[PDB]
Amino acid sequence: SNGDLIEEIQASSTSTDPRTFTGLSIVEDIGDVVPVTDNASPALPVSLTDADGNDVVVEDVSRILPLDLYGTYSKTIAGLGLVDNIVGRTVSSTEPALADTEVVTTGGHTLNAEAILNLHPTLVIIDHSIGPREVIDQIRAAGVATVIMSPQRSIASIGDDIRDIASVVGLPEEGEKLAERSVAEVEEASTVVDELTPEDPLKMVFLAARGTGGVFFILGDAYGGRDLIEGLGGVDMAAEKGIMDLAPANAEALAELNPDVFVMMSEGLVSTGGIDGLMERPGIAQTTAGQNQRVLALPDGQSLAFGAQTGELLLRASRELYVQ
Ligand code: HEM
Structure with a gap:
C-alpha cells in the first residue's frame, strides 16, 4: 500500500x-495489522510468572480481552493470528477489525468489571496503564486467567514486547516472525526518517x-x-x-x-x-x-x-x- x-x-x-x-x-x-499466519495453533497450556509476580496458567485462549491504554496488545494479538479470538476491547483499540467488538471501559479508560465478566473471557492480557487495580483483582478472583504485562515500550524493545505476548498465548514461532518483521519495518522506516531529518x-x-x-x-x-x-x-x-x-x-x-x-x-x-x-x-x-x-x-x-x-x-x- x-x-x-x-x-x-x-x-x-x-x-x-x-x-x-x-x-x-x-x-x-x-488499519488492521497484517497477521503473520492464517492458521495459528496455540500450544497450550502455558505457565508463566507475570510482571506483577503472579503465577498464571493459560489454558484456553478462545476468548481474549487484550486491554491497555495505548492500543498495543489487541494489535499484537491480531498480528499473531488470533484476531478472531478477541471478544472485547478498550476505547484505545480503534483498529477496524474490532470496531463492532464490545467496549469494556467506561468514561474514557476505566475498567468495568461487569462488562468484562459478562463476556465470559478465557484470558485477560492487561497492564497497569489502565485500572482500577481493584477491577483486575476482581476478575481474577472470579476465575478469569489474567496476565499482567509490563512492556518496555521503546522502539528498541518492540520485538521483545511482541515475543512476551506470543509466549502468553503459546505462539512462539508466530511471535518470532512478527517481532522480526516489525523491527525490520522500523529499521527501514528509520532510514527514511534519517534522510529526511x-x-x-x-x-x-x-x-x-x-x-x-x-x-x-x-x-x-x-x-x-x-x-x-x-x-x-x-x-x-x-x-x-x-x-x-x-x-x-x-x-x-x-x-x-x-x-x-x-x-x-x-x-x-x-x-x-x-x-x-x-x-x-x-x-x-x-x-x-x-x-x-x-x-x-x-x-x-x-x-x-x-x-x-x-x-x-x-x-x-x-x-x-x-x-x-
Ligand atoms: C489523562 C486523562 C485522560 C482522560 C480523562 C481520557 C479520556 C478519554 C475519553 C473520554 C475518550 C473517549 C473519546 C471518544 O469516545 O472518541 C478517550 C479516548 C482515547 N484515549 Fe484517552 N484519556 C486520557 C488520557 C489518555 C492517554 C494518556 C492516552 C495514551 C495512549 C490515551 C489514549 C486514548 C485513545 C487512543 C483514545 C481513542 C480515541 C478514539 O476513539 O479515536 N488517553 N480518552
Missing part, C-alpha cells in the same frame, strides 16, 4: 525546509487533548512521548525539561518548551475544536508551532501503541513532517 507514499517521499526536493511548513498534517489510520532537529511536544476543558497536557517519559518524537527525528522538549509523567500545557509551560511542532492524536485534536480551537488555548499561539499552526496529528490508537505498526507510522508521519 506504500507504493504512492514512497513516490512522494523520493520526489521531495533537497531545498525543502520543514521549518517553513504551516498548518495541520494528519496521518490517516493505518533536518540538520537541526525540530523541537516537538506530544500534546494530549480530550475535549475543550482541562484534559490538556504535555505527555512525558512514562507515556512514550519521547520514544515517538525521537523516532520521528525530533527532540522531545518534555524530555529536555525532565517531564516524567505529564505536565499541564499552560501558557508558562508552552512558552518554556516552545516547540516547532505539536504532535497530537487526531480525534483528540477534533475534540478540542480542531486547529482553530487549539489556537484559542492560552499560550499556544505564541509558540513557534502556534505561529505556524504546525500540528502533526496521528491516529489515536496507533500514535503511542508502538508495536507492529510502528514502522508504517514513522514512515507516514515523517512524510507529513518533512515532505511538502
Whole structure:
C-alpha cells in the first residue's frame, strides 16, 4: 500500500525546509495489522510468572480481552493470528477489525468489571496503564486467567514486547516472525526518517487533548512521548525539561518548551475544536508551532501503541513532517 507514499517521499526536493511548513498534517489510520499466519495453533497450556509476580496458567485462549491504554496488545494479538479470538476491547483499540467488538471501559479508560465478566473471557492480557487495580483483582478472583504485562515500550524493545505476548498465548514461532518483521519495518522506516531529518532537529511536544476543558497536557517519559518524537527525528522538549509523567500545557509551560511542532492524536485534536480551537488555548499561539499552526496529528490508537505498526507510522508521519 506504500507504493504512492514512497513516490512522494523520493520526489521531495533537497531545498525543502520543514521549518517553513504551516498548518495541520494528519496521518490517516493505518488499519488492521497484517497477521503473520492464517492458521495459528496455540500450544497450550502455558505457565508463566507475570510482571506483577503472579503465577498464571493459560489454558484456553478462545476468548481474549487484550486491554491497555495505548492500543498495543489487541494489535499484537491480531498480528499473531488470533484476531478472531478477541471478544472485547478498550476505547484505545480503534483498529477496524474490532470496531463492532464490545467496549469494556467506561468514561474514557476505566475498567468495568461487569462488562468484562459478562463476556465470559478465557484470558485477560492487561497492564497497569489502565485500572482500577481493584477491577483486575476482581476478575481474577472470579476465575478469569489474567496476565499482567509490563512492556518496555521503546522502539528498541518492540520485538521483545511482541515475543512476551506470543509466549502468553503459546505462539512462539508466530511471535518470532512478527517481532522480526516489525523491527525490520522500523529499521527501514528509520532510514527514511534519517534522510529526511533536518540538520537541526525540530523541537516537538506530544500534546494530549480530550475535549475543550482541562484534559490538556504535555505527555512525558512514562507515556512514550519521547520514544515517538525521537523516532520521528525530533527532540522531545518534555524530555529536555525532565517531564516524567505529564505536565499541564499552560501558557508558562508552552512558552518554556516552545516547540516547532505539536504532535497530537487526531480525534483528540477534533475534540478540542480542531486547529482553530487549539489556537484559542492560552499560550499556544505564541509558540513557534502556534505561529505556524504546525500540528502533526496521528491516529489515536496507533500514535503511542508502538508495536507492529510502528514502522508504517514513522514512515507516514515523517512524510507529513518533512515532505511538502
Ligand atoms: C489523562 C486523562 C485522560 C482522560 C480523562 C481520557 C479520556 C478519554 C475519553 C473520554 C475518550 C473517549 C473519546 C471518544 O469516545 O472518541 C478517550 C479516548 C482515547 N484515549 Fe484517552 N484519556 C486520557 C488520557 C489518555 C492517554 C494518556 C492516552 C495514551 C495512549 C490515551 C489514549 C486514548 C485513545 C487512543 C483514545 C481513542 C480515541 C478514539 O476513539 O479515536 N488517553 N480518552
